[PDB]
Design a binder for this molecule. Structure first.
Ligand SMILES: COc1ccc2cc(-c3cnc(C(=O)NCC(=O)O)c(O)c3)ccc2c1
Ligand SMILES: [Mn+2]
Length: 197
Protein backbone atom coordinates (compact mmCIF):
# COMPACT_ATOMS: atom_id res chain seq x y z
CA UNK A 1 0.00 0.00 0.00
CA UNK A 2 1.20 3.55 -0.71
CA UNK A 3 2.13 5.81 2.19
CA UNK A 4 -1.05 7.87 2.08
CA UNK A 5 -3.30 4.86 1.38
CA UNK A 6 -1.75 2.95 4.30
CA UNK A 7 -2.05 6.05 6.48
CA UNK A 8 -5.55 7.28 5.68
CA UNK A 9 -7.40 4.03 5.05
CA UNK A 10 -5.74 2.00 7.82
CA UNK A 11 -3.67 3.77 10.48
CA UNK A 12 -5.94 6.79 11.08
CA UNK A 13 -9.29 4.99 11.55
CA UNK A 14 -7.53 2.12 13.31
CA UNK A 15 -5.88 4.35 15.92
CA UNK A 16 -9.17 6.16 16.48
CA UNK A 17 -11.16 2.94 16.84
CA UNK A 18 -8.69 0.84 18.87
CA UNK A 19 -5.64 3.00 19.62
CA UNK A 20 -3.40 0.12 18.53
CA UNK A 21 -2.29 -0.54 14.96
CA UNK A 22 -0.07 -3.21 13.41
CA UNK A 23 1.31 -3.15 9.86
CA UNK A 24 3.12 -6.24 8.59
CA UNK A 25 5.83 -6.51 5.94
CA UNK A 26 6.39 -2.78 6.27
CA UNK A 27 9.58 -2.47 4.20
CA UNK A 28 10.12 -5.93 2.69
CA UNK A 29 12.74 -8.62 3.19
CA UNK A 30 15.62 -6.72 1.60
CA UNK A 31 15.25 -3.41 3.45
CA UNK A 32 14.38 -5.19 6.69
CA UNK A 33 17.32 -7.60 6.49
CA UNK A 34 19.59 -4.60 5.95
CA UNK A 35 18.12 -2.85 9.00
CA UNK A 36 18.71 -5.99 11.04
CA UNK A 37 22.30 -6.20 9.83
CA UNK A 38 22.90 -2.65 11.03
CA UNK A 39 21.31 -3.23 14.44
CA UNK A 40 23.15 -6.53 14.93
CA UNK A 41 26.26 -4.55 14.00
CA UNK A 42 25.60 -1.93 16.67
CA UNK A 43 25.15 -4.50 19.44
CA UNK A 44 27.63 -7.21 18.36
CA UNK A 45 30.29 -4.47 18.24
CA UNK A 46 29.57 -2.44 21.39
CA UNK A 47 23.35 0.46 28.12
CA UNK A 48 21.26 -2.25 26.45
CA UNK A 49 19.69 0.51 24.33
CA UNK A 50 21.17 3.15 22.03
CA UNK A 51 19.83 6.31 20.40
CA UNK A 52 20.17 6.90 16.65
CA UNK A 53 19.50 10.16 14.83
CA UNK A 54 19.55 8.34 11.47
CA UNK A 55 22.43 10.12 9.71
CA UNK A 56 25.19 8.33 11.63
CA UNK A 57 27.56 6.09 9.63
CA UNK A 58 26.09 2.63 9.18
CA UNK A 59 22.68 3.69 10.51
CA UNK A 60 21.62 5.06 7.11
CA UNK A 61 19.07 2.26 6.68
CA UNK A 62 17.79 3.01 10.20
CA UNK A 63 17.37 6.66 9.24
CA UNK A 64 15.48 5.37 6.21
CA UNK A 65 13.03 3.58 8.51
CA UNK A 66 12.64 6.68 10.69
CA UNK A 67 12.00 8.70 7.52
CA UNK A 68 9.32 6.24 6.42
CA UNK A 69 7.54 6.46 9.77
CA UNK A 70 7.72 10.24 9.40
CA UNK A 71 6.04 10.04 5.99
CA UNK A 72 3.18 7.97 7.40
CA UNK A 73 2.76 10.39 10.32
CA UNK A 74 2.85 13.46 8.06
CA UNK A 75 -0.09 11.98 6.19
CA UNK A 76 -1.94 11.15 9.42
CA UNK A 77 -1.50 14.64 10.91
CA UNK A 78 -4.72 16.31 12.01
CA UNK A 79 -6.61 13.02 11.72
CA UNK A 80 -5.04 11.17 14.67
CA UNK A 81 -7.40 12.18 17.43
CA UNK A 82 -7.14 15.83 18.41
CA UNK A 83 -3.32 15.68 18.52
CA UNK A 84 -1.15 17.90 16.34
CA UNK A 85 2.21 16.17 15.86
CA UNK A 86 5.06 18.67 15.49
CA UNK A 87 8.12 16.57 16.35
CA UNK A 88 9.55 13.30 17.57
CA UNK A 89 12.41 11.79 19.54
CA UNK A 90 15.44 10.03 18.10
CA UNK A 91 15.21 6.26 17.55
CA UNK A 92 15.83 3.97 20.53
CA UNK A 93 17.30 0.62 19.49
CA UNK A 94 16.38 -1.88 22.21
CA UNK A 95 17.95 -5.25 22.97
CA UNK A 96 16.56 -7.96 25.20
CA UNK A 97 19.62 -10.20 25.59
CA UNK A 98 17.54 -13.38 25.73
CA UNK A 99 18.19 -14.38 29.36
CA UNK A 100 14.56 -14.33 30.46
CA UNK A 101 14.39 -10.54 30.55
CA UNK A 102 11.42 -8.37 29.71
CA UNK A 103 9.83 -5.15 30.82
CA UNK A 104 7.24 -4.96 33.57
CA UNK A 105 3.86 -3.41 32.92
CA UNK A 106 4.51 0.28 32.31
CA UNK A 107 2.99 3.33 30.64
CA UNK A 108 5.24 5.17 28.21
CA UNK A 109 4.05 8.72 29.00
CA UNK A 110 2.09 8.94 32.27
CA UNK A 111 3.22 12.45 33.29
CA UNK A 112 2.40 14.37 30.11
CA UNK A 113 5.93 14.77 28.79
CA UNK A 114 4.51 15.40 25.30
CA UNK A 115 4.61 11.96 23.70
CA UNK A 116 1.29 10.78 22.29
CA UNK A 117 2.19 8.06 19.77
CA UNK A 118 4.63 5.17 20.11
CA UNK A 119 6.18 3.63 16.99
CA UNK A 120 8.02 0.31 17.29
CA UNK A 121 9.76 -1.61 14.51
CA UNK A 122 10.54 -5.32 14.86
CA UNK A 123 13.55 -6.91 13.16
CA UNK A 124 13.36 -10.46 14.53
CA UNK A 125 13.65 -13.09 11.80
CA UNK A 126 11.75 -16.37 12.13
CA UNK A 127 10.73 -15.61 15.72
CA UNK A 128 8.51 -18.11 17.55
CA UNK A 129 6.63 -16.80 20.58
CA UNK A 130 6.17 -20.33 21.94
CA UNK A 131 9.90 -21.06 22.08
CA UNK A 132 11.31 -17.56 22.62
CA UNK A 133 8.32 -15.70 24.06
CA UNK A 134 9.07 -11.99 24.20
CA UNK A 135 5.49 -11.03 23.41
CA UNK A 136 4.23 -7.49 23.96
CA UNK A 137 0.92 -7.38 25.83
CA UNK A 138 -1.12 -4.17 25.67
CA UNK A 139 -4.12 -3.80 27.98
CA UNK A 140 -5.94 -1.12 26.00
CA UNK A 141 -7.62 1.14 28.57
CA UNK A 142 -9.13 -2.04 29.94
CA UNK A 143 -11.18 -3.19 26.92
CA UNK A 144 -11.76 -6.57 28.65
CA UNK A 145 -9.23 -8.33 26.46
CA UNK A 146 -5.57 -7.55 26.02
CA UNK A 147 -3.61 -7.58 22.76
CA UNK A 148 -0.61 -9.87 22.26
CA UNK A 149 1.84 -8.65 19.62
CA UNK A 150 4.63 -10.93 18.50
CA UNK A 151 7.84 -9.07 17.58
CA UNK A 152 7.63 -10.52 14.06
CA UNK A 153 10.23 -9.37 11.52
CA UNK A 154 9.42 -6.28 9.46
CA UNK A 155 6.44 -5.38 11.66
CA UNK A 156 5.47 -1.80 12.50
CA UNK A 157 3.40 -1.06 15.61
CA UNK A 158 1.68 2.15 16.67
CA UNK A 159 -0.10 2.80 19.93
CA UNK A 160 -1.02 5.75 22.11
CA UNK A 161 1.71 6.50 24.63
CA UNK A 162 -0.40 7.91 27.48
CA UNK A 163 -2.17 5.94 30.21
CA UNK A 164 -4.57 4.49 27.62
CA UNK A 165 -2.20 1.62 26.73
CA UNK A 166 -0.46 0.01 29.71
CA UNK A 167 1.79 -2.72 28.38
CA UNK A 168 4.36 -5.31 29.40
CA UNK A 169 7.05 -7.17 27.46
CA UNK A 170 6.90 -10.86 28.33
CA UNK A 171 10.22 -12.55 29.11
CA UNK A 172 12.54 -13.10 26.15
CA UNK A 173 14.54 -16.32 25.82
CA UNK A 174 16.10 -15.32 22.48
CA UNK A 175 17.82 -12.09 21.49
CA UNK A 176 15.10 -9.51 20.76
CA UNK A 177 15.83 -6.40 18.69
CA UNK A 178 13.45 -3.51 18.12
CA UNK A 179 13.51 0.18 17.21
CA UNK A 180 11.19 2.71 18.86
CA UNK A 181 10.34 6.31 17.98
CA UNK A 182 8.00 8.57 19.96
CA UNK A 183 5.91 11.38 18.46
CA UNK A 184 5.07 14.56 20.35
CA UNK A 185 1.90 16.57 20.74
CA UNK A 186 2.57 20.26 20.14
CA UNK A 187 0.60 21.62 23.10
CA UNK A 188 1.44 18.87 25.60
CA UNK A 189 5.13 19.11 24.66
CA UNK A 190 5.18 22.90 25.00
CA UNK A 191 3.69 22.65 28.48
CA UNK A 192 6.24 19.95 29.30
CA UNK A 193 9.17 22.12 28.21
CA UNK A 194 8.22 24.78 30.76
CA UNK A 195 7.74 22.34 33.64
CA UNK A 196 11.10 20.64 33.12
CA UNK A 197 13.68 23.47 33.06
C1 LIG B 1 17.53 5.54 30.91
O1 LIG B 1 16.86 6.24 29.91
C2 LIG B 1 15.77 5.57 29.33
C3 LIG B 1 14.77 6.29 28.66
C4 LIG B 1 13.70 5.62 28.09
C5 LIG B 1 13.61 4.22 28.18
C6 LIG B 1 12.53 3.53 27.60
C7 LIG B 1 12.49 2.14 27.72
C8 LIG B 1 11.37 1.30 27.13
C9 LIG B 1 10.04 1.65 27.23
N1 LIG B 1 9.11 0.88 26.71
C10 LIG B 1 9.43 -0.23 26.09
C11 LIG B 1 8.36 -1.11 25.48
O2 LIG B 1 7.22 -1.03 25.81
N2 LIG B 1 8.80 -2.05 24.47
C12 LIG B 1 7.87 -2.94 23.81
C13 LIG B 1 8.69 -3.82 22.87
O3 LIG B 1 9.94 -3.75 22.88
O4 LIG B 1 8.10 -4.60 22.08
C14 LIG B 1 10.74 -0.63 25.95
O5 LIG B 1 11.07 -1.81 25.28
C15 LIG B 1 11.75 0.14 26.48
C16 LIG B 1 13.48 1.44 28.38
C17 LIG B 1 14.54 2.12 28.94
C18 LIG B 1 14.60 3.52 28.84
C19 LIG B 1 15.68 4.19 29.41
MN1 LIG C 1 7.09 0.88 26.34
Amino acid sequence: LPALKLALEYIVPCMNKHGICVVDDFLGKETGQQIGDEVRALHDTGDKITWIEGKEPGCETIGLLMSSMDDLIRHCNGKLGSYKINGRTKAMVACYPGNGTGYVRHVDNPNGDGRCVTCIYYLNKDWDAKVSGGILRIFPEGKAQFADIEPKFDRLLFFWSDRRNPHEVQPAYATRYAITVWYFDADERARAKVKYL
